[PDB]
Amino acid sequence: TDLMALPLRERLIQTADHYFRNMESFDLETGLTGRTADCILKVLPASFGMPDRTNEECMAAHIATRADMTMKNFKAWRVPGSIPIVDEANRKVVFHMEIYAEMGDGVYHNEFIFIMTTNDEGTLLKEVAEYVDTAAEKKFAAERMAR
Amino acid sequence: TDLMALPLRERLIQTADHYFRNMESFDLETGLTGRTADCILKVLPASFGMPDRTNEECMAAHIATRADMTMKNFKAWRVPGSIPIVDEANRKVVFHMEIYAEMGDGVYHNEFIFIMTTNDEGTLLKEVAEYVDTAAEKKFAAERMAR
Numbered sequence: 001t002d003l004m005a006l007p008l009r010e011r012l013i014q015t016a017d018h019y020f021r022n023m024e025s026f027d028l029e030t031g032l033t034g035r036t037a038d039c040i041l042k043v044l045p046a047s048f049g050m051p052d053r054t055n056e057e058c059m060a061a062h063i064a065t066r067a068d069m070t071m072k073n074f075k076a077w078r079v080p081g082s083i084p085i086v087d088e089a090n091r092k093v094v095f096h097m098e099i100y101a102e103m104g105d106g107v108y109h110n111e112f113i114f115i116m117t118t119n120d121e122g123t124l125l126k127e128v129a130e131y132v133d134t135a136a137e138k139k140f141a142a143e144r145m146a147r
Numbered sequence: 148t149d150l151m152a153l154p155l156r157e158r159l160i161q162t163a164d165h166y167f168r169n170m171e172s173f174d175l176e177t178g179l180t181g182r183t184a185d186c187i188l189k190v191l192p193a194s195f196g197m198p199d200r201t202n203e204e205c206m207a208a209h210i211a212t213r214a215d216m217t218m219k220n221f222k223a224w225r226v227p228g229s230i231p232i233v234d235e236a237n238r239k240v241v242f243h244m245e246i247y248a249e250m251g252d253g254v255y256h257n258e259f260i261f262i263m264t265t266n267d268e269g270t271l272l273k274e275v276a277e278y279v280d281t282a283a284e285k286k287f288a289a290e291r292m293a294r
């Protein structure tokens with residue numbers, strides 16, 4: 001494909017970044033793209049108590065969160081100064097990210113580490129691990145419940 | 148050096164891992180080793196409100212934290228399953244870590260991401276960035292306040 005004609009470093013970055021572009025242009029029609037069938041989302045740290053999720057579990061969560069909290073105009077950007085960290089050998093890419101969205105209750109805007117793992121070919125995501133701001137996310141969860 | 152004869156990947160992992168070995172064997176006479184003079188520790192996420200610190204600032208903080216909470220027997224290990232993520236071109240290593248210590252009040256045991264950046268030679272750390280468990284670390288700070 002056109003992905004395979006790119007150098008591996010570049011391919012890994014494009015594949016990993018796609019996760020964010022997908023979130024920004026998300027619709028029910030197309031859903032979550034550029035993931036392997038068996039891809040797993042892991043939410044770090046363990047203390048946060050979010051189990052690993054399949055693509056289908058992720059899609060269900062995101063539809064509901066967006067409805068419940070009237071969220072839209074998602075935008076993701078790298079923390080100023082940060083860079084993509086790419087381990088070609090291990091098919092991994094590490095980003096230091098901000099995610100922003102408008103919602104009924106104001107704005108969602110949190111900071112994250114994401115660790116993406118691709119398939120051997122560097123063309124799809126097989127794992128995404130995101131380390132979240134536990135204090136911030138526990139507050140969002142409490143705003144969402146009964147709200 | 149012996150370090151310079153090692154392939155760069157291995158050099159980077161050794162220089163990044165040294166940070167945790169230094170933490171385990173920490174003492175007043177030897178201090179913090181394996182860092183550039185101008186090395187900075189960054190604590191993420193920004194919401195946690197901890198400023199960047201110099202080697203001197205880190206050393207003083209650790210002395211204090213160990214005294215105040217009577218902490219000892221530190222151990223660091225990679226989260227089971229995780230691996231070191233090495234970006235040779237950018238001189239970076241990413242670890243998914245647990246840190247454990249005995250203290251008066253029981254046990255400190257938290258989960259992190261560390262992003263280590265070396266000098267161009269890969270022999271010294273010039274930046275350490277650690278993404279912490281904000282709920283957990285808030286508690287620990289609250290417990291450290293008069294107790």
Ligand SMILES: Cc1oc(=O)c2c(c1C)O[C@]1(C)[C@H](O)[C@@H]3O[C@](O)(CC[C@H](C)[C@H]1C2)C(C)(C)C3=O
Pocket residue numbers: 022023026043050061062063065066099108130132137
């Ligand atoms: C495709 C997509 O659509 C969405 O609508 C949202 C998505 C994604 C990836 O991710 C975030 C931004 C968030 O990164 C992720 O989800 C959370 O449940 C929090 C809810 C937020 C609002 C959620 C929204 C987690 C704490 C585990 C977390 O970090």
Ligand SMILES: Cc1oc(=O)c2c(c1C)O[C@]1(C)[C@H](O)[C@@H]3O[C@](O)(CC[C@H](C)[C@H]1C2)C(C)(C)C3=O
Pocket residue numbers: 169170173190197209210212213218246255277279284
């Ligand atoms: C050499 C060394 O000696 C020490 O005594 C400790 C050290 C190190 C590296 O690191 C930790 C384990 C911790 O990773 C770090 O410092 C904290 O302020 C909390 C206190 C803990 C106990 C602290 C103790 C932070 C919230 C920013 C944090 O993550």
Ligand SMILES: [Cl-]
Pocket residue numbers: 041058
């Ligand atoms: Cl997802």
Ligand SMILES: [Cl-]
Pocket residue numbers: 161162163165166180181182270271272
């Ligand atoms: Cl070092």
Ligand SMILES: [Cl-]
Pocket residue numbers: 188205
């Ligand atoms: Cl330190």
Ligand SMILES: [Cl-]
Pocket residue numbers: 262263264274275276
């Ligand atoms: Cl770093």
